[PDB]
Each structure stands twice: as C-alpha cells, then as structure tokens.
Design a protein around this nucleic acid. Structure first.
Ligand SMILES: [Mg+2]
Ligand SMILES: [Zn+2]
Ligand SMILES: [Zn+2]
Lengths: 99, 79, 1337
RNA sequence: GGAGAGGUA
C-alpha cells in the first residue's frame, strides 16, 4: 500500500520519481493514455500529462490554486518535450516551432 | 448526490458539450460570486451544476444569453 | 501559441548561432573542490551560473546585480535554469561525415552523389583516393584509386589534377555540383532507355534531387564542420556518494572526441608526416561516429562490463528512448497503489478506500479546508496538524470526499473499460475494496492483483469523470452490445439453485396470495425453497404508448421463483423468471431490462440481483465433496473391451496382415470411441441419478449432485472438466504433435500413476509456455493496430453518398454461422429495401436499423441489405456520423467528434490472448434448388453436367429466403436441373475430385489430330486390360521432333469435316495438354459430356497478424488480369508463358507460370477478369486492383471474423472496416491530366480527391488514381505528420528522411497533440479545436 | 542515474 501527493522530482526530466523506496508516484503508462483517449475524456488526459507531472510552473500554480480553493490550471508545455528538442538538435538536425 | 447523468444528457443530447456547460456553470458558482437556483443539501458544486442542468432551467444558450445580459449591465454599471 | 513544427538541416553558421561559447578542454570536475573546470566540458563562463544569481568567484551574489558579468569569471549572474538551455559548440580541426546520412540504408550521400556505398565507405576511412575534377587527363570526374594507383597516376601526371582522400574530398565533391541542372540531365535521360530498373533508379534519384531544390538545404551540410554539444544539465554528473561519480557515458564520448580533436590540432600545427595525420583523422572520424550513433559501425565501444555506451541516437530509439518512455506516458503525482479485496456491500457506483491513502492523496484539499475554516493561519501549522492528525482532520477529510470521484486502474489495461471512475468510501483497513460485479470488466481475480488510484484535480476533470467514466455509464461493451456486468460466478449459482423444483418437497400444492406471502412462508420454515405452488401475480405491460397496464393472473411456479419476482422492476413479463435461470438467462434478462426500461432501473436491478444471489447462495450451503464425483459403474467393462479390441489389431499386425499406419489409425479410432462411450455413460449416470418418489411410487428428475449443479448453471467449468474428473481423461499428445497410442485411463478421483502424470505434465508445460509467448506477441499486435487508426475521428454529420455494401447472412457450406439480424443491427441503410412484395418500400433509405426495424426485416424474411459502411465515406480527414452507425456502447447514433479508431483498435486487440497460436453433396433440408452461373448440358443418363467453374448451388426454403449454399466443382454431375424440390438427406450431385477429365460438349467422332507416336506422344498401351491407350508427352517428355506441333482433338461427323461449336463459329478442337492419358480410339463415337481423356490433379493469432499486415501468401493463386481469350507462347524456360487477347483491344499482357501450377482453363476458352487461373490463397493486393475496394474489404472482414468466431468471441464488423479504411489510404497516379502531380508520384488519397473534386468545378480535367494497399507496419510510417511516425518504430530512418526532405508537421492527429501537451481533437476538446480553427482561419 | 539477478499479477 502506497500513496504520493507531492514529493521529489527527477533531475534530467522533471517528472516524479519511481518506486516505493523513494517517495515516487505511479506511472500513467501508454496503454492508459490510449484508454483515456477512447472515452471522450480530453481535459483529464491533458492535465494528467501536463500539469500533474511535467510543466513546472503549471504545477506550482496548480498547488497555489488548490490551496486557495479555486480549481483550475495553466497548462504550458511539458519540460520533457524541451529535453527531446534539445537532444535531437544536438545532432545536425535543426528543429524548431514555427509561428 | 448523483449516480447517473442520463436525464441530464436527455436535456442536452451530446454528452460532450454537457461537460463544458456544466463546468462553466460550476466555475461561475465556485470562484464567481453566484448562487444556486436549486436548494443545496451539502453537495459539491459539480453535482449542483449537474442537478441544475437536469431540471432544464440552464442549458448552453440560456447561459450565453444570461452572460450577455449581465455583461451589458456591467457595461452600463460604469455610467 | 505555435502551430507547426519545422525540421531541416543545420548549416555550420547556424550551429554557431545557437551556441553560447566553445568547448576546448576534456576536463570536468576537480573531485576535491566541486566547482567546474576553466572552460572544460562543463563550465560556468559558457553555459551559466551554478547557483541562482551567484557569480562563480563570489564577487557578486545578489539578484541586485542581475545581467552584469564578473570581470574575472565572465559568468552571467542569472538563474540556474539557463544551465539547461544553453548549448556549446566544438570546433573540429578536420571535416567529418555525419554517420546517419551515410549508413541509413538507403544512404542519402550514396545516391545523391550516385556512387556505390562501398567506395564511399573506403574513401571516408582513409584507405583510397578519389579524383575531384580530373579534367585535361585520362581520369574522369570521380574515379577511385588505390594508394599505389594514386602515386603512379601523379607520377605520370604530375599536372594539376586533384585527387583527395576522405571527408574533405567528399565535401568538395558535393559542394562542386549543381542540383537543378543535374535534375534536367537526369529527367532527359529518364525520358527513355530504359524503363526496366533504371526507371526506378532515376525516379528515386530525381525525387531526392528535387527534394533538395524544393527545400532550403545545401547538399554539403551533410558534412559536419562544427559539432554542437548537449547542455550540461541534460547529461548530469550524478555522484555515487562514495566519493566518486557514476558512469554517465555521454560525457565519456564527448571527452574522447575532444581528446582526438586536440591531438589532431597539435599534429596539424607541428607539421607531421602525412601518415600520422591520416591516422589521426581516421580516429577522429571514428570518435564522431561513436558519438552520433554507436553500434551502426562495425564495432561498438564500451567502458566496462562489455556493454556498449549510449550514443545520442540510442536515447531516442527503443522503449528506453524519450518517445516511448518519458514523452507518451509519464509518471504522475497524486497517485497510489494497493491490493484489492471484495467487500460485496457496496453500491455499483462506489469503492472502498483506505484511510491512510485517502489522507495522503487529498492533502492539498485538506490544507485548503483548514485554512478556510481558520484552524491554521499558515501552511506550516496546517502541515503539522495533518502530520499528527488531530482528530479534527478526519471529519474534514470526510467533508472533502463527499462527491469527488477517483480513477481506478489495473496494470495490463487492454480495452476502454480497464480504467474506470468511482466514488470513494473511507474504510478502516489497508486494501482497496472493489465492487464484485466490475471484476469481469477489469478481468481482476482477487488472488493478489494490485490496482492503482488516481485523483482528478481540476473541475472539468471531475465532471468528465462523473459524466463519462462513472461505473454506472459503462454497461455495454464497446466491442459489441452485449452487457459487461453479467453476474459472474457465485450469484449465478445462487440464483440457479433458487429457481428449481424438487418433485416432492415440503408444502407442495398450496396456494399463495402473492410473492411476499411466499417469502414469509419460506422464512418461517414451513415450505422448502423450491416446491410447485400456485401463486397469483400482477404483471405490468407497457405495450401501450408508454403507459404501464397492470394485469393479474394465477400462475403455477415454485416459491423460489415467486420470491425472486419481488426484485424485478415493473415492466417485464413474468415468464422471464420462470425457467431454471442459468448464466445465459441472467444475461438475457439484464439485456431485455436495459432495452425496455432505460438505464437507471437496470443498474439498480443488477445491484439487487447481486444481493439476493449472494444471500441465497450462502443459504444453500452448496459444498463439494469426494462422494459427489460418481464414477460410472461400466467404466471398467468399457475399458477392458477396448483393451481386447486393441489387442486383436495388435495381433493382426503381428502377422503382417495389416500395415503399421492402419494399425495405428485403428487403435486411435477405437480408443476415441471408448473415451466417448465412457464420457456419455458418466454424464447420463450423473445428471439424472436422482430418483425420488412423488408421494406415490417413484420418479426421476434433474440431479442435485453438487458438481453437476455448478457445471450446468454455468458458474464454473464446462463438461470437459467433469469428463476429466470422472471419466477417463482422453488421449494425451507428445511434444512433436503426435498422439500417444495409449491413452490415460485414469480420472482424478482415482490416482494417476507415474507415467500418466509425466505425460500430463508435458501437456501442461506446453500450455503455459504457449500462453506466455502468445500474450507477448498480442501486445505488439495491438500496439501496431492502434498506431495506424489513432488519427481517425468522426468529424461530420452526413457525407451524403449512396454506395454501401451488401450485408447478407454468412454461409460456410453448412448451416448459417451468423444470421442477418446480428450483422446489420445498428447500421444505417444505403438504399431503402423493398419488401418481397416488390415495389413495396419497407424502410426508408437513411434510417437506423435498430431492434424494431430488425423485427420487421425478420418477419418479412429479407435476404440482403445495402448498408452504408465506413470504407467509402467521402468526408476528408474523418468519417461522417451516419456512415459509422450506432455507438454500440450506448443506444443511439454516434456523437459528432468522437475517437473511433482507437476504440476499434483496442476492441480488436483485446481478445488477442484468447486465441490459439499453432465427395458428394448431401442436401440436408427440403427446399427449392437454384444455380448461379450455370453453363451445362444433359449427359447420357439424363442428369445435368456442368461446364463452368463459378457454378454455385443455393437451397432456398419455401419462403424464398436462401438457407444453404454449396460449391459445385467443374464437370460435376447433378441429379436435378434448376428450380426443383429436394428431399432432406438427398444426395444431389457427385463428381470425381481426384482426376480431371477432358469433357467434351456434343456427340460425334473424336479424331486424334497432331497425335503422333514416337516424338509427340508415347504408345503406353494399357497392359493389365489391353484397350487402346496413348499418353501425350509433355514438352519435357517429348524429344525435339514433336515440339512444334500442338496435339488436339476435333469433333467430327461421318462426313469427316469439323463439327462446329453450337452458337459460335470457332471450330471445336480441344488442345490436349501434356501428360494426358487417353483410352478411346480415333474416329470413335462418343456422347456429350464424356471423359475424352484423363489428367490427374494456419488458423492462429499469426493468421490475424499476417492478414492485417497484408503479407503476400506463399503460393499466390494467380488471377485473370483482364477479359478475353487466352493463349500460350514460348515454353520451357523453366516456366510457361501465358498471353491474353481481348475481343478487340490490345493484348500486351504476358506472364510467367511456374510449371507446378494446374491451370484449369485451356487456351481456346475466353476468360473474364477476376477468374482464378491457379488454386491457392488470394493475395489482397491483386484483389484490390482487380475487383475494386468493396471486394478486398469483404474478404478481409470475412476471414478475420472467421478466425475469431471459430474461437467463440464476438466482435462487431465496424471495428475491422475502420482498420481497413485506414489501411487503404495511399493512391498512385496513372494520368496527371490538368493537375500538377508527376506521373509516378504516390500521393495521399485525400489530397488527390479534393484536388480533382475542386478542379472539375472549373473546366479542367482531373487526375486518375489507382488505390493501393499497404500493410499497417508500412502504412503508419508513410504518414504526412512525421512526429506520429517517429514515435512509432525505427525513428532513425523516418527522421533522417524527413530532415532531408524538410517536412513540416502541423499537429492534427491524436498522438502529436498528446506529445506537445494540449487538448486532443477527439473528445471534449473537439469544441475547442473547432473554435481554434474557426478563429485563426 | 545505469546495469545484473530474483519475484508478483
Ligand atoms: Mg490475478
Ligand atoms: Zn566572479
Ligand atoms: Zn459518410
């Protein structure tokens, strides 16, 4: 039996750690993302992989809002995607976001 | 308390825009300083919004027209 | 904000533009003072500060000094986040070649420069020479030279011709070329000479060359001169806390390449002999190869443990890469995990939750409530109060939980029902209690399964949970309408034991005043739970317009059934709870209740069913004992007789009277017979052993033996397990597929001895290993499927078309495997059906065929219906609402803006683990006989002899609706003609499936024309009898003499001239094929349809995988490409030739036939396109290109549905049609017309369709396209959006190709929008995306 | 942080 609300954070990619030894959270695996897409559920998926795990400013503001009793979010963009962008740009490939 | 959403879906026959309209109403109710149109029995805002939708005294179009009316008065509130 | 992702090549200047400095030293950390080095791989002056607003030396350490730099460090005092976003750039002394653009297979350098990859491989590693311009001399542009050859050439030609060696040479050669001019030359050359393989080669090269000019990439940028470096923090140097550091191999590769670079820099400065610099440049090239991608070269490099290091290209590919590890599915906060128990006191819409998990998940909400209530005027005090949980916090926690759903999920979540919402109820335990009905949906046994809990935070998430995933909204499985909360295994036993009747129980025959009276009687103990009794009941029927009408009557039932009736809702006929109520009956009862009384009554009724079932099952005390496994008393006699029977055949084969194979087969057969007899005897003695007096003398009834009561009701175990428990347990198979001739003659109530147990052990281990491998493979299958249909979303209201498909009941030769009413239930019609009162419009043309219309079809005995199908909908980038049909997970038409591709893929992949890995026509029903495609004559016996191949016979009942079908082989004799009446069990036709005749058409004399013994045939006269016999020598059998002539046989008359074919003017001479044995003589009378001569003749998961992947079969049944007569040509070049000549058109089509193919047709026969030329599996590609689209789709759906329903699993057809629609999506242009598409381009079908459709509005002529079928594995890669492809397999190839082409992704699928982290255009986000499109545009 | 081994569903 294990639980996690807000604990540590990995280093290279800002996501909650894994395992019970560290105070890590569970893994919303790929197949679960498919399952959520199968419903019409879109908001829950978007928050569940934007503001609950990765987008740092998003989750700080989410915590502030929740404490202040006003449920909302500020999505932003995942940090892991920026990691991928830099890593793929480290080759000769020039990849960027347009207008 | 609610267990189903069937009748509410009957009032709003899409089951997707239902979510958005109910969310907007609950947002008015929680952070906004509005009040319910149905007596509350120690129920949270989401369920109260769904119950309001159920009786058919709030749907998308009436919500929009009420928003327009209150915004018109707000424009008239500065004088 | 942004809207598109652009990808291209990076020129060295741009790379310098990115960078914020230059790396020059391979040193990182001092290991004593943990500051970085001067300007080493890490650094502060290049990348940034180490602490927030802290200069390195400490001259300024406050945010007041933001922006300024230190005068000794030069660092920029600012946040430390800059340390994750600045990039350095190394300077490379020598040019070097990007490995990806060299060994990509195909290699872009190789075919852009158009040199064999071997020679570039040699040149780029400094073991040869290549000329650059090579003019004014014997040499050409790009001849290769060995070292000695170069020395000799420069010796004889010490003039100015340049021949260099390695990366610099490649760079100069590439930079010294003009692209578009080369394109002109190559298109001019491709004009012709030649379109055999040079056509393909030049088309590919021109494609690449025009790709460069179209984009903004210079060719030479594929040669790296400046190499960027990943920021420091994305490759952190984690300490091991043992005073040392971990491996962190990326920094190792960087230091290695920097060492090589500095070595070469020094050696170039100091002017060493050329050998040294060449060696060092080779080493540098290898270092860069290692850094960019380690392994693709001949040998990987390792630090220790003999394990290769992680190159950059290894941090993207594979499960460990970003895409499939940290980008599609992340870890997540606000979660928990636990074990699950049953707790059957819960409503259907709630689940237990331990106190501790509840107080740990919801902590922020508790803080919010505490601060709102003023019990803690800060977050620290509130955190303290929660930490030591003063008694107040528990009531607060209960207050928070009131209406806050959570999500429960299980680990291998296959289908959409694997993750479901619930309300939480706090429990003083440590295990998640789960309602026992949903275990079927989760496939969650309680033998230690763990489940994970998530909480939705925002408001919209809570409402989405409640209105989409709350368990009382998923009752019908998306795969098919069947309910998914069927009472599973124990409640069913309780109900079955409740609705029974002993012939004479306590209190039999009295009369009661309604159900509750019976309940009171039973509880008081005066009447047993089941005894026949008359009771008055008041049914309700709403046959009126939604009005319930009460009607009372005096039924005769058993007190158990009367008690049960007290539970059911109002509007259900009483006969629904009158039978024995097995499992199937309960499922049907729930289905009818749902289809009559909406939803809420059904859910409440299901809950009440569960409660009563558990209660009365517990009352039953249905236990299992060792006396309840009765061994039939005749088992020993049966087995002994079978033993003697085996012994006699053993004796026969001892004396040689029989052969080994026949002895073996007879032994197996008789053992099977003995096994069946034992099973039957056991079952008969088990199911009716109860004989009990009926207050008179004696009678018998259905037995109460516990095992039988569990098996028959359907709780657990079929009859096979009962056979294995009581009767002999069959024959066991040894590993290599053989069947042991000695069965196991011992059940489990008795003991198995050693050997029998050994054999059973082998069988069990085979089963276990098979399950493991099978599930492993099925996972990959489903992952492939969901990645080719993920981008499809019903996105309109009505496409407005008329084409559909003909839905009919399926026939396999025998009975109906699937009626019509279950194939068109819930699919809109295409063309209004006309009742068989023809001109009587029974249904409108665009109505949904729900249950009532299905009944109307059934009573009128409709036969075949035109139904709109999702394979032909004309909407672009999605399908229209009507074309799809009924949602199938809730009883109404599909809502606009719904993701169907994903649910279809999951529904097909979910059952993938339940599959397995490795004469004469006898009409059996009275009815009329009809024949399709009959070309027949009447033979000598008055029967009907057929002269066509596609002749098919249908037996139609008296109604006029087809009921049976059978395939009629060619030249098969038929007792009947057409439109007769057949008696049941009548043998209606017969044929000789062994050998093929030379059947003629009409009577006359038969003349052996061009039939010469010695060099054309052989006089192999029959020797056992002595009649005339002569055998045609095949082309191989005959010598050179008879090669030219063609043996034939022309029908003639007494006059001697050639009698003509009836009807037409082609003289009737039949071309004798090789190896044709003839028995009749020359000029001998024969009758119509007589034998002129004789000429002799997987199902597992891999089948589904192969069928969807569209793999070519082993032995392709080649088809008839076009219509017209056929002929032969050049022969015996290891294969035959076939040519086909239309009636009037050109006849270019010729083809090769391997000799082992039994062409059923002869040359003089005219064949229409689509008729088999050989026999065997039919590939899908030719099916598509010949019989259009509505044939390949039907073939695929029929085959897959066969493989599934043979294992008793139901899947609606739509889920396969959608996959096929997404599969056949690329089109190829035959004629451009007034369009712009080049001749051979393979273009997306949607683009060409819209271009032609809009162009025809003007006076332009559109293009012509031919649809193409690609297996899913190839179809998902050839997609416009390249991020979708990259997240799928083999990122390297697609990524390099896209980079060269300079593609530009526009984020329209359901997957890349997940990657970027914005709303999906699938569900609720569809409204947002609609507004977003309508605003910007 | 990465490897190797064992285990559960
Ligand atoms: Mg289990
Ligand atoms: Zn300083
Ligand atoms: Zn359509």
């Amino acid at each position: 039996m294990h639980a996690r609300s807000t604990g540590s954070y990995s280093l290279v990619t800002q996501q909650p750690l894994g395992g019970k030894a560290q105070f890590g959270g569970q893994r919303f695996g790929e197949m679960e993302v498919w399952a959520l897409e199968a419903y019409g559920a879109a908001y829950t998926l978007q928050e569940m992989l934007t503001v609950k795990s990765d987008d740092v400013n998003g989750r700080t503001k989410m915590y502030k809002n929740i404490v202040d009793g006003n449920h909302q979010m500020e999505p932003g963009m995942p940090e892991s995607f920026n990691v991928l962008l830099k890593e793929i740009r480290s080759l000769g490939i020039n990849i960027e976001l347009e207008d | 308390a609610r267990v189903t959403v069937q009748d509410a879906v009957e009032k709003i026959g899409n089951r997707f825009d239902l979510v958005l309209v109910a969310a907007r109403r609950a947002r008015q109710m929680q952070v906004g300083g509005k009040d319910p149109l149905v007596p509350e029995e120690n129920d949270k805002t989401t369920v109260i919004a769904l119950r309001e939708i159920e009786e058919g005294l709030i749907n998308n179009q009436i919500l929009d027209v009420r928003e327009r009316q209150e915004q018109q008065e707000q424009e008239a509130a500065e004088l | 904000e942004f809207d598109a992702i652009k990808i291209a090549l990076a020129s060295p200047d741009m790379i310098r533009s990115w960078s914020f400095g230059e790396v020059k030293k391979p040193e990182t950390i001092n290991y004593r003072t943990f500051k970085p080095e001067r300007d080493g791989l890490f650094c502060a002056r290049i990348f940034g500060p180490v602490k927030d607003y802290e200069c390195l030396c400490g001259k300024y350490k406050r945010l007041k000094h933001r922006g300024v730099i230190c005068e000794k460090c030069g660092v920029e005092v600012t946040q430390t986040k800059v340390r994750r976003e600045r990039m350095g750039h190394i300077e490379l002394a020598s040019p070097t070649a990007h490995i990806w653009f060299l060994k990509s297979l195909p290699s872009r350098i190789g075919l852009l420069l158009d040199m064999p990859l071997r020679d570039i491989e040699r040149v780029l590693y400094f073991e040869s020479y290549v000329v650059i311009e090579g003019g004014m001399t014997n040499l050409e542009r790009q001849q290769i030279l060995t070292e000695e050859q170069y020395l000799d050439a420069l010796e004889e030609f010490g003039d100015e011709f340049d021949a260099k060696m390695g990366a610099e040479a490649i760079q100069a050669l590439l930079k010294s070329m003009d692209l578009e001019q080369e394109c002109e030359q190559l298109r001019e050359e491709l004009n012709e000479t030649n379109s055999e393989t040079k056509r393909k080669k030049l088309t590919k090269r021109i494609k690449l060359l025009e790709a460069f000019v179209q984009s903004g990439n210079k060719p030479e940028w594929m040669i790296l001169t400046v190499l960027p470096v990943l920021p420091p923090d994305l490759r952190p140097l984690v300490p091991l806390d043992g005073g040392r550091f971990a491996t962190s191999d990326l920094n190792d590769l960087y230091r290695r390449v920097i060492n090589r670079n500095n070595r070469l820099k020094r050696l170039l400065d100091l002017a060493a002999p050329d050998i040294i610099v060449r060696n060092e440049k080779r080493m540098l090239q290898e270092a860069v190869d290692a850094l960019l991608d380690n392994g693709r070269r001949g040998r990987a490099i390792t630090g220790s443990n003999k394990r290769p290091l992680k190159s950059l290209a290894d941090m993207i590919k594979g499960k460990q890469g970003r895409f499939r590890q940290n980008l599609l599915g992340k870890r997540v906060d606000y979660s928990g995990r636990s074990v699950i128990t049953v707790g059957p006191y819960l409503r259907l819409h709630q689940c237990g939750l331990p106190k501790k998990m509840a107080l740990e998940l919801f902590k922020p909400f508790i803080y919010g409530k505490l601060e709102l209530r003023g019990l803690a005027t800060t977050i620290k005090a509130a955190k303290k109060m929660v930490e030591r949980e003063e008694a107040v916090v528990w009531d607060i926690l209960d207050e928070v939980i009131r209406e806050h759903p959570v999500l429960l999920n299980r680990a291998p979540t296959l289908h959409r029902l694997g993750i479901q919402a619930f309300e939480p109820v706090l429990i003083e335990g440590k295990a998640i209690q789960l309602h026992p009905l949903v275990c079927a949906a989760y496939n969650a046994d309680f033998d230690g399964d763990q489940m994970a809990v998530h909480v939705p935070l925002t408001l919209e998430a809570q409402l989405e949970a409640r209105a989409l995933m709350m368990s009382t909204n998923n009752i019908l499985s998306p795969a098919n309408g069947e309910p998914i909360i069927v009472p599973s295994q124990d409640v069913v036993l309780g109900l079955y034991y409740m609705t029974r009747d002993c012939v004479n129980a306590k209190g039999e025959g009295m009369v009661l005043t309604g159900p509750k009276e019976a309940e009171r009687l039973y509880r008081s103990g005066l009447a047993s739970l089941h005894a026949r009794v008359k009771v008055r009941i008041t049914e309700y029927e709403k046959d009126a317009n939604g009005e319930l009408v009460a009607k009372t009557s005096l039924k005769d039932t058993t007190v158990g059934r009367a008690i049960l009736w007290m539970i059911v809702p109002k509007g259900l006929p009483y006969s629904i709870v009158n039978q024995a109520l097995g499992k199937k009956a309960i499922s049907k009862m729930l289905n009818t209740c749902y289809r009559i009384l909406g939803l809420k009554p059904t859910v409440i009724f299901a809950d009440q069913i569960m409660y009563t079932g558990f209660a009365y099952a517990a009352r039953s005390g249905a236990s299992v004992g060792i006396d309840d496994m009765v061994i039939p008393e005749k088992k020993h006699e049966i087995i002994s007789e079978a033993e003697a029977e085996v012994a006699e055949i053993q004796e026969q084969f001892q004396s040689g009277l029989v052969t080994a194979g026949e002895r073996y087969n007879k032994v197996i057969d008789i053992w099977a017979a003995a096994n069946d007899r034992v099973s039957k005897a056991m079952m008969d003695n088990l199911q009716t052993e109860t004989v009990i007096n009926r207050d008179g003398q004696e009678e018998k009834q259905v037995s109460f033996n516990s095992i039988y009561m569990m098996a028959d009701s359907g709780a657990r175990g079929s009859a096979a397990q009962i056979r294995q428990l009581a009767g002999m347990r069959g024959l066991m198979a040894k590993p290599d597929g053989s069947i042991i001739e000695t069965p196991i003659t011992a059940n489990f109530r008795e003991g198995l001895n050693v050997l029998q147990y050994f054999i059973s052990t082998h069988g069990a281990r085979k089963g276990l290993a098979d399950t493991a491998l099978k599930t492993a493979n099925s996972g990959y299958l489903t992952r492939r499927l969901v990645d080719v249909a993920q981008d499809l979303v019903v996105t309109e209201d009505d496409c407005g078309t008329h084409e559909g498909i003909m839905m009919t009941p399926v026939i396999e030769g025998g009975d109906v495997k699937e009626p019509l009413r279950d194939r068109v239930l819930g699919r809109v019609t295409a063309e209004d059906v006309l009742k068989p009162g023809t001109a009587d419009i029974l249904v409108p043309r665009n109505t949904l065929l729900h249950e009532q219309w299905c009944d109307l079809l059934e009573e009128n005995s409709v036969d075949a219906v035109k139904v709109r199908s999702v394979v032909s909908c004309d909407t672009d980038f999605g399908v229209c609402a009507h074309c799809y049909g009924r949602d199938l997970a809730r009883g109404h038409i599909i809502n606009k803006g719904e993701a169907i591709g994903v649910i279809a893929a999951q529904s097909i992949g979910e059952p993938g683990t339940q599959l397995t890995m490795r004469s004469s026509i006898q009409v059996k029903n009275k009815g009329s006989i009809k024949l399709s495609n009959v070309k027949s004559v009447v033979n000598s016996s008055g029967k009907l002899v057929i002269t066509s191949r596609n002749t098919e016979l249908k037996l139609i009942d008296e109604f006029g609706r087809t009921k049976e079908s059978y395939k009629v082989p060619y030249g098969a004799v038929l007792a009947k003609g057409d439109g007769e009446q057949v008696a049941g069990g009548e043998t209606v036709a017969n044929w000789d499936p062994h050998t093929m005749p030379v059947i003629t058409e009409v009577s006359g004399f038969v003349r052996f024309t061009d039939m010469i013994d010695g060099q054309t045939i052989t006089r192999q006269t029959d020797e056992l009898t002595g009649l005339s016999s002569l055998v045609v020598l095949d082309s191989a059998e005959r010598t050179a003499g008879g090669k030219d002539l063609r043996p034939a046989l022309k029908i003639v008359d007494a006059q001697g001239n050639d009698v003509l074919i009836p009807g037409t003017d082609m003289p009737a001479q039949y071309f004798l094929p090789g190896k044709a044995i003839v028995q009749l003589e020359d000029g001998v009378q024969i009758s119509s349809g007589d034998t002129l001569a004789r000429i002799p003749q997987t199902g597992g998961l891999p089948r589904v995988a192969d069928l969807f992947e569209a793999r070519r079969p082993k032995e392709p049944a080649i088809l008839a490409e076009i219509s017209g007569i056929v002929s032969f040509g050049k022969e015996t070049k290891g294969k035959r030739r076939l040519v086909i000549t239309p009636v009037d058109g050109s006849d270019p089509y010729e083809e090769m036939i391997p000799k082992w193919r039994q062409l059923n047709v002869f040359e003089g026969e005219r064949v229409e396109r689509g008729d088999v030329i050989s026999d065997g599996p039919e590939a899908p590609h030719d099916i598509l290109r010949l019989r259009g689209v509505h044939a390949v789709t039907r073939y695929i759906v029929n085959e897959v549905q066969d493989v599934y329903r043979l294992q008793g699993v139901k899947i609606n057809d739509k889920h396969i049609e959608v996959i096929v629609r997404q599969m056949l999506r690329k089109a190829t242009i035959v004629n451009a017309g007034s369009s712009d598409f080049l001749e051979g381009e393979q273009v997306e079908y949607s683009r060409v369709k819209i271009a032609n459709r809009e162009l025809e509005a003007n006076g332009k002529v559109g293009a012509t396209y031919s649809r193409d079928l690609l297996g899913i594995t190839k179809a998902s890669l050839a997609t416009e959006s390249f991020i979708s492809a990259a997240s799928f397999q083999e990122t390297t190839r697609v990524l390099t190709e896209a980079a060269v082409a300079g593609k530009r992704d526009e984020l329209r699928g359901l997957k890349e929008n997940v990657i970027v982290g914005r709303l999906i255009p699938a569900g609720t986000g569809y409204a947002y995306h609609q507004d977003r499109m309508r605003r910007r545009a």
